[PDB]
Copies of this chain bind each other. A is one copy, B any other.
Amino acid sequence: ECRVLSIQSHVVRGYVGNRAATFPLQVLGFEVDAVNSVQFSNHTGYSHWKGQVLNSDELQELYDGLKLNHVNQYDYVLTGYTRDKSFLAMVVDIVQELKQQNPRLVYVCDPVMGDQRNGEGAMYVPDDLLPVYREKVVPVADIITPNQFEAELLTGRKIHSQEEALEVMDMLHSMGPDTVVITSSNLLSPRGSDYLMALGSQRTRGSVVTQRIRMEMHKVDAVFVGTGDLFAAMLLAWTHKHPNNLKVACEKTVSAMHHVLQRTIKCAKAKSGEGVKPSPAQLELRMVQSKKDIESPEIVVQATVL
């Protein structure tokens, strides 16, 4: 039995934050405890949204409830989008304390910054969260999934090539996490300009061996919300099943991603009128219908070892 504490947004309709992470982890066999950092009607890709936010004091009370009952034993912690630095600082305190009674606990973190759509009713992540991610979060995180933009902010460097990316990833390793994945970048894939390139690095174990990989997936003709949340949740699951093989973990995670996205776009175009661009409501991830692909994804991508 593996127990995950996931602290992310909750939307009534659709998939983002905890909605995008819970179902996948459950069908894969993980026990998921979900703290909903906010509760909104839907994500920010729609024209309207309403809801309420949970403050750091409220998050503390919920955790204390678990502590008072002596049920605060976790194997994993999972976090993502946050637009509140005080909330984030509270998350760090909770993780450190959890790692105290279980030094084997793995903290998976997606350090979201910028203007990514989300389920917390925000248009942007405050610039002041950067120092908190750099100095408090990353140092205690074991697996991080920054996109290029985020990897550059965290290291103060700019990536202009594949070589600089590996250097940036090494710096991230020195900051703390043994597994780093740059989920997307603007690096032109040598396979074509329509493929999105992803890079992965894993320090295993006197000399620590580093396993580096690169992957490429063809872009999809649409804008989706919650894909970063789904990606991190499935990577958690597969790295747990393949602890020393980042290659297989990523191939399964990226393949699953492909199956869900393809089914989603196909359904969206079928529900929209002819020659009409699908709306955000029509583009919600087809989560429930992709159950089998999530459980056992047909491999459609091959990672090359660098």
Chain A residues with CB under 8 Å of chain B are 10, 12-13, 23, 26-27, 29-36, 39-42, 46-52, 54, 58, 61-66, 68-71, 281, 287-289, 291
Contacts and interface: CB of A to CB of B under 8 A. Distances in A.
Main secondary structure of the interface of A (DSSP, over half): mixed
Pick the 9 closest A-B CB pairs, nearest first: A41-B65, A50-B65, A48-B68, A50-B61, A13-B33, A46-B69, A41-B62, A12-B33, A41-B66
Contacts of A64: 41, 50
Contacts of A50: 61-62, 64-65, 68
A288 B31 contact: yes
A46 B26 CA distance: 24
Tallying the copies of this chain within the complex gives 2
Contacts of A12: 33-35, 62, 65-66
Given A58-B52, A65-B41, A69-B46, A27 B29 contact: no
Contacts of A47: 68-69
Contacts of A42: 65-66, 69, 71
A47 B63 CA distance: 15
